[PDB]
Amino acid sequence: QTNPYARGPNPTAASLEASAGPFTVRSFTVSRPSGYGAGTVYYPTNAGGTVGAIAIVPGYTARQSSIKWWGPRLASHGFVVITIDTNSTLDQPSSRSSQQMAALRQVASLNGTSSSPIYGKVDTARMGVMGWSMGGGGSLISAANNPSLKAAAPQAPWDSSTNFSSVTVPTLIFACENDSIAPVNSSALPIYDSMSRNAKQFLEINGGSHSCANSGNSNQALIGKKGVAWMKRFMDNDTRYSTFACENPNSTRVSDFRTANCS
Secondary structure: OOOOOOOOOOOOHHHHHOOOOOOOEEEEEOOOOOOOOEEEEEEEOOOOOOEEEEEEEOOOOOOHHHOOOHHHHHHOOOOEEEEEEOOOOOOOHHHHHHHHHHHHHHHHHHHOOOOOOOOOOEEEEEEEEEEEOHHHHHHHHHHHHOOOOOEEEEEOOOOOOOOOOOOOOOEEEEEEOOOOOOOHHHHHHHHHHHOOOOOEEEEEEOOOOOOOOOOOOOOHHHHHHHHHHHHHHHHOOOHHHHHHHHOOOOOOOEEEEEEEOOO
């Protein structure tokens, strides 16, 4: 009769492009991180039911400030988000994946802790992974090793191997056209091309440097619209987002677009 995971009013193009969605957002610092360096948790106060969880990791030498804007933007549409700092700023993708999954593990334990702000707010069976550069490589390793994850959306990914043909998780890849650290022709695009068994999408930002999807970027309307809709459609099975998730935006800010196995 109804989707038990659907939350919030019917989405529109304007509402997905605004800086904030429908729910009020609060946040707190993790007092004693378990297996990673530091973490901030963003959550909705009034979503009307339990919601899925997303863990986000930055890149080599980077910290939480680079990916922070995703916290309030995703949480305000009905998600619990944890953004992390790694044990060392110089950790490699394999280690970054380990710490991303330890962060999801701790969010799950906080759901059962009555003193926590997110006590009872999380559906621990529905989780997803995001991250930038080496942390986006780490996100793909996480999905390849843990196929119960519901969604993946790395940005400017990099890894020592481009072969991710074992990934069965729905994966959205954000790429930046003018990336000189993890160039599209030698990382993001071969990574996308290796995935043969999943719903997938490739979205390359016109004229974008390596940090084209970080906090402060000038395409937050489009990037945020696509990120929220992808997570809504595949973590929540919410078919109100099916067109927003799979469609070609037909935008002057996208220089390359590709999708497979979506509808």
